[PDB]
Structure 1
Amino acid sequence: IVGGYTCGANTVPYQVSLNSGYHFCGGSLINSQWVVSAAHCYKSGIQVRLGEDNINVVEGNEQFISASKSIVHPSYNSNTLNNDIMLIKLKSAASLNSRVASISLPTSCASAGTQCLISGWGNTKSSGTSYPDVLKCLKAPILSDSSCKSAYPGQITSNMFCAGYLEGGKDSCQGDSGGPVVCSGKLQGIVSWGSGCAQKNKPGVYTKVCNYVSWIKQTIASN
C-alpha cells in the first residue's frame, strides 16, 4: 500500500497472508474453512496465516493453517486478468474470534463514489521498494466505469473496477495482490492489477466480487 496508514494490530480481522516460506499475497477469510484471493496468486504449498499484524514476529493471535485445495475461477485468463479470483479451502476450520473473523460477501454491486478500505503487506513506495512488516490500510473510493476505462483503454472488463485517486500518491501495490477491498462491511473487490503504483491516471484495478457470489456459494456447497 502506497500512501496509506498503519491499520493497527488485528483491526482488519478478515485479512490473511498467504505464505509459501514468505508472504506473497493477501486474501480474505469468508467463512471458517475458506479464503477469497486473486487467481494470479495461485501456487501449490500455500499456508494461510490468519490473525497477523507483524508478519515477521509471532505476536500471539496468529493461526497458521495449510490449504487443502485451491480452486482458480473456471474462466480466469492470466494474460488479460479477466476473472482474477480463486478460492482456497483450509485443512481445518479457523477459530473465529474478534481478531480472526470472516467478511460478508456482497448482496449487491457497489457504486462509484462508495468509500472502501484496502489493506495489505505490499510495497509502500511508488519509486523504490520498501516492504512493511505490519499491515497497512488505505481508504479509497470506487471510481466510475468511464474513468476506469479512460485510464486503461481496452483493458477494463465488466469483472473489474478501479478504486483510488487519479492524482496518484495513494494506491495498492505489488504484494497487496489478492487482498480485500471492503466497502460498508462487504467484500466488493480483490487487489488485482494496475500500471505501477500510485502514478497519476493509473489507479488500482480490482476484481468485481459481486459478480462471483453465486460461483463462490455453489463452490463452497460442493467442496
Structure 2
Amino acid sequence: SLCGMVWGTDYHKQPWQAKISVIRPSKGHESCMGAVVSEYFVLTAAHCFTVDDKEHSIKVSVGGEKRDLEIEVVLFHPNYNINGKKEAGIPEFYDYDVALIKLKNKLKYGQTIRPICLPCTEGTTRALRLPPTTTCQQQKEELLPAQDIKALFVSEEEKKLTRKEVYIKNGDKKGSCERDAQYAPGYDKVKDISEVVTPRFLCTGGVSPYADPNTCRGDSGGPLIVHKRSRFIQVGVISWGVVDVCKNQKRQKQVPAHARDFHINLFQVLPWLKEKLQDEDLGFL
C-alpha cells in the first residue's frame, strides 16, 4: 500500500487517525486514539483496555464515522504490566504500553481511511524515497536524528481533529526531558528516574525550542508522527504525560518548562510489531 499519503478537513488530512471510546467509562478511562496500520489492524496503547475481556472493553471508529468496527482480538505487548513496579512505589508503569486491535472485517481505504507508514518497512523506504539497501538503522537515523525533531500528534473532539506540532527532545535536551518525569504525580519519590522512563520512550513537551502543546489522557494510543516530503511516518504511540492539560491546565502553567509527554518509540518494539503484522503485506525489513 502507499502509506502516510493524503488521498479537505479533519480525517481528509489525517485519514489514519482512529477514535477509541471506553464502553464502561470512568475517571481516567473514557477515550483513546489509535492509528490504522493495515486493512485489519489499529495500533494503540495497552492501557486503553480492561485486562479482562479486552475485545468488549472499547469501541473503535475510523474516518470520523458514527459506526464502530468489529474487534476480533486485542494483542497487548507481552512486556506490558501497569502494576509491574508497584514494589518500587511506582503506582502505574507504562513500559511497552502498545497494543494491536485486530479487526474482524477488512477496512476499505478511501479519502478518510488510509494507513500510516511504520518504521522499518518497505512502505517507509518508498515514502522517504530511499534505496533498497536501506536498513532499519538507516531509517532510524533519517527519522530520529540526535536533535530536537519536528513532529506532530492529533487530538479529537466531536469528529473534529486538531493537529499539534511538538518537538521530540532526542539531542542535548533528551536527559532534561526524561528527568522531568519527576513532575508527574506518583513518580516524584523514585530516586533513579530511568526506572519509570525506560529506553522505550521518546519525550516531547516543554517550551524550548518551541511551546509544545501537551497531551491529555484521551490522546493515549494516538500516533506520534514525523512529516517528511508530503509523507507521514508514525514513530511513536502516545503513552503518558506529566500533566493532563484538558483537566489541569493550571498545573501546566505552574511548571511549563517541565510539562513533558512520553511516547512508546516504535523502533524499540519492532520485533513484536513485525511478528504480529507479518501477514499484513507491510514488508518489514
Compute the TM-score of the two structures, normalised by the length of structure 1: 0.81
Cα deviation, residue 164, structure 1: 2.5
Contact 2:152/2:165 (<8 A) preserved: yes
1:191 aligns with 2:230: no
In structure 1, what residue type is equivalent to 2:274? K
Which residue, 113, 116, 138 being the options, matches 1:100?
113
Kept after mapping to 1: 8 A contact 2:31/2:217: no
- Give runs of aligned pairs for residues 24-103 of structure 1, distance below 5 A: 24-43=31-50, 44=54, 45=56, 46-52=58-64, 64-78=68-82, 79-103=92-116
Distance 2:214 2:237 in 1: 13
Note if contact 1:63-1:94 (Cα within 8 Å) is conserved in structure 2.
no
User: C-alpha separation between the residues in 1 aligned to 2:220 and 2:271?
Assistant: 23
Report the equivalent of 2:271: 214
5+ residue gaps, structure 2 = 1-7, 83-91, 121-138, 183-192, 246-251, 281-285
Distance between the aligned counterparts of 2:69 and 2:224, measured in 1? 23
Distance 1:207 1:166 in 2: 21
Flag the structure with higher helix content.
2
**Unmatched segments (≥5 aa) in structure 1:** 1-6, 53-60, 122-131
The structural deviation recorded for 1:196 is 1.2
Measured in 1, the distance between the counterparts of 2:262 and 2:243 equals 11
Superposition RMSD on alpha carbons, in Å?
Answer: 2.3
Partner secondary structure for residue 171 of structure 1: coil
3-state DSSP of counterpart to 1:135: strand
Q: Conserved in 2, the CA contact under 8 Å of 1:106 and 1:210?
A: yes
Q: Hey, what does 1:129 align to over in structure 2? A: none
Residues 92-150 of structure 1: per-residue CA shift (max 9 Å, x gap): 011111210000101233134221110122xxxxxxxxxx3222220111013212222
- Equivalent of 1:180 in 198, 201, 223: 223
Is 1:18 equivalent to 2:11 in the alignment? no
Contact 2:16/2:35 (<8 A) preserved: yes
CA distance in 2, matches of 1:34, 1:152: 31
Structure 2: how far apart are the matches of 1:80 and 1:29? 26
Give the secondary-structure state (helix, strand or coil) at the position aligned to 1:172: coil
**For residues 50 and 159 of structure 1, do their structure 2 counterparts lie closer, same or farther at Cα, with a shift above 3 Å needed?**
same
Note the C-alpha offset of 1:20. Answer: 4.1
Amino acid across the alignment from 1:138: K
Q: Which has the higher contact order (CA 8 A, sep 6+)?
A: 1
SS of match in other structure, 1:68:
strand
**SS of aligned partner of 1:142:** strand
Give the equivalent residue in structure 2 for 1:161.
Answer: 202
Task: State TM-score, norm by structure 2.
Answer: 0.64
Bigger Cα Rg: 2
